[PDB]
């Protein structure tokens, strides 16, 4: 990172997609000029309440501070850079995108490999992306969703529909609550199954065998499978345990657990039986967890797309929804890598940053069309 200033200089000068960025945040009078940005400099010193007249101004400033990070905040009632002139109470956050922040640490207790990321546990992010995006688009009817790699151990989602940008904390909160399933045992399903639950479960089943029974190997052995047993009622404990001892592999174990869980009787006074426990286990293991604060708060700062991670060097890139399954956090272009690519290409539009910029542009055309 000692060479980060030099690299960031070249990057902010030649690679950062200023026209696309400004198309985004400019989309309403003063909407770009009332946006807060916060830059972070050396030593974790950051300034809040920056705002800019236009694209050119933004470019000059970024090229002059060459910030380590950039956060985007809310659209305010006045230019944030003038907020000190504004009378008491008058300066107020007015609008902002609905944002989600999936972070891999949220699931430490369900990974056997990392505490950090790797191939074996990124699938968690794949599932969180498909689940959340499907609910936002199909259930809420939100049309403009930008998914972004955080540069390290997770993803961000920017919901940018005009009506959404206007939503209040109470509504943002209710959306998060609509989306949340995992709160000891963290998942408890109602008897009557809502379509959100069904469709998320389906998504999870696309991956569950390979992620959980083979990558993570959750029923590999005693200390493993006892964790699963904790999530199920105690009357079926020993039958399951002995079944798991006769069994050799995680797939056998899981199959038995399904058969047995579908035979558990929820009320003595009712002959109804189903996949609830199985589903509760799958969800507790694979469903996204959602911080109410990040999404609820309207003035909340969030890492900017096309930021550079000050530790990894990786660019916060847009994720192509069409290829969720193939996104690879380990082959994300670093600032080092793309700057080096400049020597061989001798053209700035032709580094490994290009396709990500295309994902961005695409999302922009959908905003436009709207």
Among 28, 41, 47, 118, binds Zn ion (CB under 5 A): 118
Note the residue count of the chain. 370
Site string for Mn ion, 49-88 (x = CB under 5 A): ----------------------------------------
Say what the alpha-carbon torsion angle 59, 61, 63, 66 is, to the nearest 10 degrees: -130
CA pair distance 227, 213, nearest whole angstrom? 14
Asked if 150 touches Mn ion (CB under 5 A), the answer is: yes
Q: How many residues bind Zn ion (CB under 5 A)?
A: 5
CA distance 150 to 158: 12
Q: Is 102 annotated as a binding residue?
A: yes
- Known binder of ligand: residue 155? yes
The strand pairing partners of 40, in sequence order, are: 46, 69
114 binds, among Mn ion, Zn ion, none (CB under 5 to 8 A by kind): Zn ion
Choose which of 114, 321, 357, 364 interacts with Zn ion (CB under 5 A): 114
Question: Using CB distances below 5 to 8 A depending on partner kind, what does residue 101 bind out of Zn ion, Mn ion, none?
Answer: Mn ion
Binding-site string for Zn ion from residue 73 to residue 112, where x marks contact by CB under 5 A and - marks none = ----------------------------------------
Query: 236-244: which pairs have CB atoms within 8 A and are 24 or more residues apart?
Result: 236/260, 236/261, 236/264, 244/219
Binding mask 85-124 for Mn ion (x = CB under 5 A): ----------------x-x---------------------
Nearer Cβ to Mn ion (35/303): 303
- φ, ψ for residue 154 (rounded to 5)? 175, -170
Instruction: Pick between residue 100 and residue 211 the one whose CB is nearest to Mn ion.
Output: 100
CB of 139 or CB of 220, closer to Zn ion:
220
Q: Which helix (DSSP H) or strand (DSSP E) does residue 25 occupy?
A: helix 18-26
Which residues make Cβ contacts (< 8 Å) with residue 294, sequence separation at least 6? 99, 100, 101, 300, 302
Active site residue 36: yes
Distance CA 370, CA 294 (A): 26
CA separation for the pair 40, 65 (Å, rounded): 9
Residues forming the annotated binding site for Zn(2+)? Answer: 113-114, 118, 121
Kindly list the residues in this chain that would bind Mn ion in the complex (CB under 5 A).
101, 103, 150, 154
List, by residue number, the catalytic residues.
36, 101, 103
């Amino acid at each position: 990172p000692t060479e980060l200033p030099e690299l960031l200089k070249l990057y902010y000068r030649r690679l950062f997609p200023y026209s696309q960025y400004y198309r985004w945040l400019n989309y309403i009078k003063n909407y770009f000029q009332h946006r807060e940005f916060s830059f972070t400099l050396k030593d974790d010193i950051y300034i809040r309440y920056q705002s800019f007249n236009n694209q050119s101004d933004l470019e000059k400033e970024m090229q002059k501070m060459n910030p380590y990070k950039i956060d985007i905040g809310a659209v305010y009632s006045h230019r944030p850079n003038q907020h000190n002139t504004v009378k008491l109470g008058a300066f107020q956050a007015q609008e902002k995108e609905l944002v989600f922040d999936i972070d891999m640490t949220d699931y430490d207790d369900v990974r056997r490999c990392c505490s950090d990321i790797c191939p074996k546990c990124w699938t968690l992010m794949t599932m969180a992306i498909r689940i959340i995006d499907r609910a936002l688009k199909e259930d809420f009817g939100f049309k403009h969703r930008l998914w972004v790699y955080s540069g390290r151990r997770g993803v961000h989602c920017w919901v940018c529909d005009e009506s959404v940008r206007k939503l209040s904390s109470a509504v943002r909160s209710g959306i998060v609550e609509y989306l949340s399933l995992v709160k000891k045992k963290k998942v408890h399903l109602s008897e009557k199954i809502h379509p959100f639950i069904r469709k998320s479960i389906n998504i999870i089943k696309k991956y569950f065998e390979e992620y959980a029974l083979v990558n993570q190997d959750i029923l590999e052995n005693k200390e493993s499978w006892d964790k699963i047993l904790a999530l199920v009622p105690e009357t079926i404990h020993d039958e399951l345990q002995q079944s798991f001892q006769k069994s050799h592999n995680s797939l056998q174990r899981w199959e038995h657990l399904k058969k047995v869980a579908s035979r558990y009787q929820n009320n003595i006074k009712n002959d109804k039986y189903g996949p609830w426990l199985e589903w509760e286990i799958m969800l507790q293991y694979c469903f996204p967890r959602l911080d109410i604060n990040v999404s609820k708060g309207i003035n909340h700062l969030l890492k900017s797309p096309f930021s550079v991670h000050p530790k990894t060097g990786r660019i916060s890139v847009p994720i192509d929804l069409q290829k969720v399954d193939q996104f690879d956090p380990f082959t994300v272009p670093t600032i080092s890598f793309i700057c080096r690519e400049l020597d061989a290409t001798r053209d700035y539009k032709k580094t490994s940053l290009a396709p990500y910029v295309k994902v961005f542009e695409h999302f922009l055309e959908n905003l436009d069309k709207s």
